[PDB]
Ligand binder design. Sequence first.
Ligand SMILES: O=C(O)c1ccc(Cl)c(Cl)c1
Length: 119
Amino acid sequence: YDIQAWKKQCEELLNLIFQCEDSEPFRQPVDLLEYPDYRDIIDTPMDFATVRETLEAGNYESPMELCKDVRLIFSNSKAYTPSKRSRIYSMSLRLSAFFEEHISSVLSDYKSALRFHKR
Ligand SMILES: O=C(O)c1ccc(Cl)c(Cl)c1
């Protein structure tokens, strides 16, 4: 019932994501020189370094907020992809499945801890 445990759990999960080859296109903001029309389609860029920095700055209040920003990385890749078969989009799908598989217990434990706190 540790209400703060999610933060280190998210740091460790981000470490695993940064080790995944599939995260390379998503570690830093999308390069506008390589994809000049990016901001015409994507309103809110997001990347894993921004997520990690936000977490480390103490600017997430809950793992739900972190999860919303990670999911935005994946929805931006889906919105920008020219094809559902593209290389970068396929990497995003594998990374999303890995992230969802690991974030589920983090969210469950946090929500359970809050409910215990307010019992
Ligand atoms: O060229 C592509 O397939 C491509 C380039 C950049 C992104 Cl973010 C995505 Cl999802 C796809």
